[PDB]
Design a binder for these strands. Structure first.
Ligand SMILES: [Zn+2]
Ligand SMILES: [Zn+2]
Ligand SMILES: [Zn+2]
Length: 85
DNA sequence: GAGGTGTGGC
DNA sequence: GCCACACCTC
């Protein structure tokens, strides 16, 4: 399958796209750049940039349907939702 | 909550 | 490659 060949790392992935992303941990490549005025943050993964942009926007797409609380990530909500039952 | 990351449908 | 789920660790 898709093995990392950097300095005997050996980590293996199921898709080449996963391997490509993992290789950035060795190269320091960060292709996803925040465009927020004044911010120069960059990230190795698109979804990391999405998390960063929500720091700028305060956007909380995941509203709990049993109380007022909202969250930036679905896993945060899923954990909270357990406390309603 | 936040960061890091393995994953898979499309 | 995009995107978001899901899990671990702090
Ligand atoms: Zn590697
Ligand atoms: Zn930014
Ligand atoms: Zn709630």
């Amino acid at each position: 399958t898709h093995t990392c060949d950097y300095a005997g790392c050996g980590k293996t992935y199921t898709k080449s796209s996963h391997l490509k992303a993992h290789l950035r941990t060795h190269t320091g490549e960060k292709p996803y750049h925040c465009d927020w005025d004044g911010c120069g943050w960059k990230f190795a993964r698109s979804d990391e940039l999405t998390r960063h942009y929500r720091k700028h926007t305060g956007h909380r797409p995941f509203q709990c349907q049993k109380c007022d609380r909202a969250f930036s990530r679905s896993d945060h909500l899923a954990l909270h939702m357990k406390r309603h039952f």
